[PDB]
Amino acid sequence: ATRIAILGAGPSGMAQLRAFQSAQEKGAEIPELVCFEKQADWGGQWNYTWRTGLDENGEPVHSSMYRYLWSNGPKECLEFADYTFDEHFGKPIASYPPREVLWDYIKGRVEKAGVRKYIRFNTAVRHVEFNEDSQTFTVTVQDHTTDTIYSEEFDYVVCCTGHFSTPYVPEFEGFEKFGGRILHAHDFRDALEFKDKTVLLVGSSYSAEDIGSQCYKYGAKKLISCYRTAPMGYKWPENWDERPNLVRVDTENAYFADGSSEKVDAIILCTGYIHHFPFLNDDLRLVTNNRLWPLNLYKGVVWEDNPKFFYIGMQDQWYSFNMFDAQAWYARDVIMGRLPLPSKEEMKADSMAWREKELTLVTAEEMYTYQGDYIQNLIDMTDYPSFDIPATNKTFLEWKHHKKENIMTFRDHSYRSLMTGTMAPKHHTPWIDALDDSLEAYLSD
Amino acid sequence: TRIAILGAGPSGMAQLRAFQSAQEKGAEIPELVCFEKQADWGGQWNYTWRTGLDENGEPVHSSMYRYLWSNGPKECLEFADYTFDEHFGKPIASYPPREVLWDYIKGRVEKAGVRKYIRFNTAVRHVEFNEDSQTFTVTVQDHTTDTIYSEEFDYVVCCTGHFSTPYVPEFEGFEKFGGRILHAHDFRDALEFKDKTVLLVGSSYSAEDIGSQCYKYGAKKLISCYRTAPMGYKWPENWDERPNLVRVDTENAYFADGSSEKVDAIILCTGYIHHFPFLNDDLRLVTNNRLWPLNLYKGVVWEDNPKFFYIGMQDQWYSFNMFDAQAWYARDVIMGRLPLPSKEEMKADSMAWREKELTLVTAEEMYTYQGDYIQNLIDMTDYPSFDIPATNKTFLEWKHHKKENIMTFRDHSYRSLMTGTMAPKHHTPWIDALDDSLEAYLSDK
């Protein structure tokens, strides 16, 4: 009788299916589930592809992940509370696993849940309309396996389409004339492409940090990072420097705000992403910048203009997978009727409260502690196994510290699991010398 | 009555110009809105450094690159109603670079004053036909304001082109290759491939020219590979033609003849697909690239809904003249000047054209076919007639010049079939004509 459409089979869409399956396992009647995915497989960002721009169906390439990518936070900060690393890998592993390993892990859970059967792959979501007459959603999709466009009626929609895929790509003067590659971090795939090259990186967040680190590791001659407002702050290697922003570009040269000048071979724009939902009209569409707390989302999940429509993972992330889990579990309970929603007036007030609080945050520590607090709120309302949130916050602190000490070796460190207490062993190869990013290599000796 | 024109490239311009011409001659024309997602008109001919997704996250439309020149004789694409001699005021050479032909196209439409009809930076999201109102609801995203809105229209003309959404096949090992893999659509600047071995995958105009550009601008070596037939042209010393790619490894490309070689980058010159993410199956054209797509009465009228039209969806020998021929016809049908047959009669007519299409073997037969097709469209409207049989003759001359020497075909000259003016020789052999600019082309040096 009740039908839910879940948009995307990324970590969040997986979490949503996991949430319902978990309720069903406990004897509960769950609604009919349909999950639309445009890729051929699950994993979202984590499913790797050599492709760039548009995929073989003409849909924008989703994954922004690149070769040699490893986890950027401690894995212990993203461990599933109901599916441990210990359960999955059958043994202790190091704290910063390669993409393939974390992909194997998140798949591992949904494999055990039997939820693949709900996903229509190779299917891109085209449009979502709310019908006021029947109080249902018409979800229109393109099945690229059959080359068919069809639609179905749903009672609730859960958007898990992510927000690190549609690039924010600013222009700089001279770009039409520059003789080198100008790509966005989203199209970055292989560091080897930039070996012995001089690479300009425009940005001062994780993509700048890590893509630079990848180019360094795989042998770029020189790296130049430029910042908009403030530098990354770390002590970079001898051939890597940070400067004020790019101002213009020659056929061969880049010109910066400090009056500085350099000959660059390639420009990689690590300038972030936008919240882009081409399948939604303004009545349903979330419009926001990347932040810990976007507005119009009750408990960070419920669309305030239409509370039958939900968003997962739309916040900026310190916490990732177990946030999505907490979000999806909450969305489940609302959908199912276990948690009734307040007035539209009372929802907005709760959101503004969280917003006002977000505005006071200065330090990294305050910020992921704020997110930790948000998740604590969510899990308390739910079956989801409460886990050690304060102890996670101390793991993040140790990680921040490890980065400040040496940015090129923070991945060499190890952390205690906050689910099992399993002390993660030191990896068989220091990050810098571990050229192989395969799962097989990582789990071997 | 209101008409939605989707796209402001040559076809969208031709359609606006058609409506402007009838209005100049006394007739009352319908109200007109044209939607363009780019900031300026031109379609393919509007160059951009951007690739993949534009600043709004819309897929980058233009597949055009630095140093691109008309690939056929300009005389084969002259407007019947706005000659080169009118626009330029002096005789020029036969293969103008992009900027020069982009200037020409704008010239006609600036003069017509049809810019007032176009809403730029606006992406077409959806078009639905409503039975009860017999109108079209065009949903649209206005990126200047970040607003999604919808307007009702009586007729819709689709001019979104079909050489933008790449066909991108995968080959075994692509995931491991250390060099670049891009489709022709992403190719921007040949200088990126200076001192490099580039593999061009494919057999048509893209492989020919993208290859020619890399040769011109200093690639170490070039390798073409064909799926069914070699291009059969006499290539330079450092240019290799081989049967199809089978496999790739980290550094090396492998071919069906058992030949292997180290390649630095792979350019997939494998063509394009007809993609309309903004239409449902009731209006959506599905076809491979060819002279006679089915479902289009007179190659133009959508047969299941005759209030919807497609301009320029055919494969192209003729280009701009046909878009006029098609634009005039569609205008005359909208304005009621040309009555439509019953669907059965339309589909019988379309079947005839398809039957004849399948008999075509040689290049001559094919552009002569299109020639005949354009003649049929001209005859029904007030569009100035022109010397098709002689255009076909020029196409023939162009074919010989390519066959004789594929590297020098651009240095030949042809006679205007609109004015009789013989094009002069250009001041620089193509090979040495490194400067892109309109300025450099129109001056003497």
Ligand SMILES: Cc1cc2nc3c(=O)[nH]c(=O)nc-3n(C[C@H](O)[C@H](O)[C@H](O)COP(=O)(O)OP(=O)(O)OC[C@H]3O[C@@H](n4cnc5c(N)ncnc54)[C@H](O)[C@@H]3O)c2cc1C
């Ligand atoms: C380069 C990169 C590295 C990262 N590294 C880390 C890390 O090390 N640690 C960490 O904790 N987090 C990392 N992240 C953060 C990341 O956002 C989360 O880990 C998580 O992957 C987000 O989950 P999601 O399911 O909400 O979105 P996504 O992972 O982006 O999944 C969204 C899914 O929806 C699908 N989709 C989108 N649109 C449509 C549509 N129209 N129709 C059908 N399907 C659609 C996509 O194909 C995709 O499968 C990284 C992100 C990026 C971009």
Ligand SMILES: Cc1cc2nc3c(=O)[nH]c(=O)nc-3n(C[C@H](O)[C@H](O)[C@H](O)COP(=O)(O)OP(=O)(O)OC[C@H]3O[C@@H](n4cnc5c(N)ncnc54)[C@H](O)[C@@H]3O)c2cc1C
């Ligand atoms: C690389 C390349 C080189 C070429 N060289 C030549 C040549 O030398 N000589 C020749 O005669 N022909 C050439 N062509 C053929 C080309 O198809 C035509 O010259 C011409 O561009 C066709 O015009 P069009 O308006 O039909 O399509 P396009 O030029 O492709 O224009 C389509 C327009 O629609 C817009 N659009 C698409 N989708 C949307 C949407 N959803 N919302 C809003 N706007 C949208 C686009 O932004 C674009 O402006 C070339 C084509 C390519 C790809």
Ligand SMILES: NC(=O)c1ccc[n+]([C@@H]2O[C@H](COP(=O)([O-])OP(=O)(O)OC[C@H]3O[C@@H](n4cnc5c(N)ncnc54)[C@H](OP(=O)(O)O)[C@@H]3O)[C@@H](O)[C@H]2O)c1
């Ligand atoms: N696992 C990994 O190794 C890894 C690798 C890549 C990405 N990621 C993930 O990807 C997500 C987002 O990372 P991100 O860095 O791409 O996004 P982001 O954190 O939002 O970073 C955006 C960056 O772009 C800069 N910027 C924006 N406009 C600019 C302009 N006009 N000129 C100069 N700089 C400009 C911003 O500078 P200001 O701050 O000054 O505004 C900021 O530094 C994170 O969750 C991260 O974990 C992880």
Ligand SMILES: NC(=O)c1ccc[n+]([C@@H]2O[C@H](COP(=O)([O-])OP(=O)(O)OC[C@H]3O[C@@H](n4cnc5c(N)ncnc54)[C@H](OP(=O)(O)O)[C@@H]3O)[C@@H](O)[C@H]2O)c1
């Ligand atoms: N102005 C210029 O200098 C210029 C430059 C580039 C493009 N263009 C224009 O762009 C338009 C399209 O030209 P295009 O060449 O890009 O497209 P196209 O004419 O459709 O040709 C596509 C090519 O890709 C090949 N192909 C498809 N799948 C393949 C596979 N799996 N393996 C190997 N090859 C495969 C096809 O080979 P098969 O023979 O097997 O089918 C065909 O040769 C034309 O109008 C052209 O004029 C112009």
